[PDB]
Amino acid sequence: KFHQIEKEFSEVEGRIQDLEKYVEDTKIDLWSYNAELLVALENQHTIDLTDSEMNKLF
Amino acid sequence: SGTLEFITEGFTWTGVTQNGGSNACKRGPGSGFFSRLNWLTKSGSTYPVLNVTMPNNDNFDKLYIWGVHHPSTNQEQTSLYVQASGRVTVSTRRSQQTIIPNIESRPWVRGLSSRISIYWTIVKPGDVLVINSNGNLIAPRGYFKMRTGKSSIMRSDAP
Amino acid sequence: MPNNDNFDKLYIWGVHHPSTNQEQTSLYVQASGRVTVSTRRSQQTIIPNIESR
Ligand SMILES: *[C@@H]1O[C@H](CO)[C@@H](O)[C@H](O)[C@H]1NC(C)=O
Numbered sequence: 001k002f003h004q005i006e007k008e009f010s011e012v013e014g015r016i017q018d019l020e021k022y023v024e025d026t027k028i029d030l031w032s033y034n035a036e037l038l039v040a041l042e043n044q045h046t047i048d049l050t051d052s053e054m055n056k057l058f
Numbered sequence: 059s060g061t062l063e064f065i066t067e068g069f070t071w072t073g074v075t076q077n078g079g080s081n082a083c084k085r086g087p088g089s090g091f092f093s094r095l096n097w098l099t100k101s102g103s104t105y106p107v108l109n110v111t112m113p114n115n116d117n118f119d120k121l122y123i124w125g126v127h128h129p130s131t132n133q134e135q136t137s138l139y140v141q142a143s144g145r146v147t148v149s150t151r152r153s154q155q156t157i158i159p160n161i162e163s164r165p166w167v168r169g170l171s172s173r174i175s176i177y178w179t180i181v182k183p184g185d186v187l188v189i190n191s192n193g194n195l196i197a198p199r200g201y202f203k204m205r206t207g208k209s210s211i212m213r214s215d216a217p
Numbered sequence: 218m219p220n221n222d223n224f225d226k227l228y229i230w231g232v233h234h235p236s237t238n239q240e241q242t243s244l245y246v247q248a249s250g251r252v253t254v255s256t257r258r259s260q261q262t263i264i265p266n267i268e269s270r
């Protein structure tokens with residue numbers, strides 16, 4: 001990603017600023033969810049496939 | 059745009075004095091001004107109605123930077139532009155920006171109570187730049203060539 | 218009015234818009250008023266409008 005919107009503001013402007021803040025705050029929350037969920041699913045699967053490998057050998 | 063590539067244009071400003079400067083904007087020991095802007099003032103005892111045109115015959119968008127002077131007193135206004143109330147208008151075939159300067163004192167900044175308002179215009183190919191002024195015009199010296207790219211800007215104090 | 222305190226001050230002000238030229242002169246003498254509020258960073262100039270609403 002290259003040129004993006006401003007994410008920090010030195011002064012109180014109003015309606016447009018609130019929207020810019022909201023858009024970014026929204027973006028971060030959605031990606032933070034995706035990250036948390038992904039690792040949880042990957043870890044559960046890793047634990048299962050390793051236990052599976054033991055049983056296959058048995 | 060990712061560039062400050064400036065191309066100078068001739069612009070004929072008849073009946074006015076060019077290249078005005080100030081001690082607030084010194085270049086060397088003597089006074090000066092923004093290099094990309096041209097401060098026009100009266101010639102003798104007259105400031106005529108300026109009516110200049112600059113066409114875009116090239117295959118790109120031109121970015122023009124110009125301004126409007128805001129004197130602190132009515133005497134300042136008249137000494138520079140003769141007329142008690144100036145006016146600046148820049149236009150293209152599809153758009154227009156008209157501004158009447160306001161005479162007003164501000165808190166002293168670098169020993170000055172006056173200011174300049176900066177404006178910008180984009181001219182597409184086959185379009186033309188029209189500048190009309192009876193006073194207070196801070197004329198452009200040319201244009202900046204516009205680009206579409208992967209460039210940006212960042213605020214940081216990191217080495 | 219200078220700000221010597223350690224916080225931001227919010228100022229609320231306004232501009233009167235008379236309905237007639239007679240009202241304008243009766244209140245403010247001059248046929249056309251003007252209001253300007255400024256700081257070192259900002260400026261707001263407003264020219265009042267005379268009109269029936
Ligand atoms: C910037 O580039 C233009 C290209 O035509 C040239 O005319 C001009 O002299 C250059 N200016 C500087 C300061 O290099």
Ligand SMILES: *[C@@H]1O[C@H](CO)[C@@H](O)[C@H](O)[C@H]1NC(C)=O
Nearest residue numbers: 107108109110111188189190
């Ligand atoms: C400026 O030049 C244009 C050329 O098309 C002309 O139409 C216009 O009348 C001129 N300005 C004035 C104030 O006459």
